[PDB]
Amino acid sequence: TRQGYYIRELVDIFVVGQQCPLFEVPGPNSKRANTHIRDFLQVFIYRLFWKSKDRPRRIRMEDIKKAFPSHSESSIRKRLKLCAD
DNA sequence: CTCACCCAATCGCAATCGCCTCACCAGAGTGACTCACCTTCCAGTGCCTAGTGTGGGGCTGGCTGAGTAAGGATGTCAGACTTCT
């Protein structure tokens, strides 16, 4: 860590074979894929509103632009259009 | 001037179809076996040649009669004699 080194011994190590997947990975730019994208952004926006101390709760746009910098700001505006002004 | 919203365009994903390929099923042909029919051979039975019994239909000798006749072989006696008792 930042403060120093720490040492443990280990005695047990597992080898994991070939995985049998139980969850389907979406494809690039698929409906489910981009749905998760806008949902991840909406959840982050709600949790930034919960963390806000001023009443009424207010956030800044460039916090979201620091978190999601590949997003066009039209999509972030779209998420903030409902629930904020 | 800057920001936000709306519209348009492009890309990606999903669904449907699309025509070609593969697989399965069915039918036909091929090969062998079995069965049936025909043909041939053999065997048996039923009549033609050969070898024959038994007989028809002729055919010719034999038959007392009494007379004329011979030697005739055959024999029935008849006697004389030699053997046995």
From Swiss-Prot:
It comes from the Eukaryota. It is found in: Nucleus. Phosphorylated by casein kinase II in vitro. The TFIID basal transcription factor complex plays a major role in the initiation of RNA polymerase II (Pol II)-dependent transcription. TFIID recognizes and binds promoters with or without a TATA box via its subunit TBP, a TATA-box-binding protein, and promotes assembly of the pre-initiation complex (PIC). The TFIID complex consists of TBP and TBP-associated factors (TAFs), including TAF1, TAF2, TAF3, TAF4, TAF5, TAF6, TAF7, TAF8, TAF9, TAF10, TAF11, TAF12 and TAF13. TAF1 is the largest component and core scaffold of the TFIID complex, involved in nucleating complex assembly. The Bromo domain mediates interaction with histones that have acetylated lysine residues at specific positions. The second domain also recognizes and binds histones that are butyrylated and crotonylated. Component of the TFIID basal transcription factor complex, composed of TATA-box-binding protein TBP, and a number of TBP-associated factors (TAFs), including TAF1, TAF2, TAF3, TAF4, TAF5, TAF6, TAF7, TAF8, TAF9, TAF10, TAF11, TAF12 and TAF13. Interacts with TAF7; the interaction is direct. TAF1, when part of the TFIID complex, interacts with C-terminus of TP53. Belongs to the TAF1 family. It is linked to Dystonia 3, torsion, X-linked: An X-linked dystonia-parkinsonism disorder. Dystonia is defined by the presence of sustained involuntary muscle contractions, often leading to abnormal postures. DYT3 is characterized by severe progressive torsion dystonia followed by parkinsonism. It has a well-defined pathology of extensive neuronal loss and mosaic gliosis in the striatum (caudate nucleus and putamen) which appears to resemble that in Huntington disease. This is Transcription initiation factor TFIID subunit 1. The chain holds residues 788 to 872 of 1893 of the full protein.
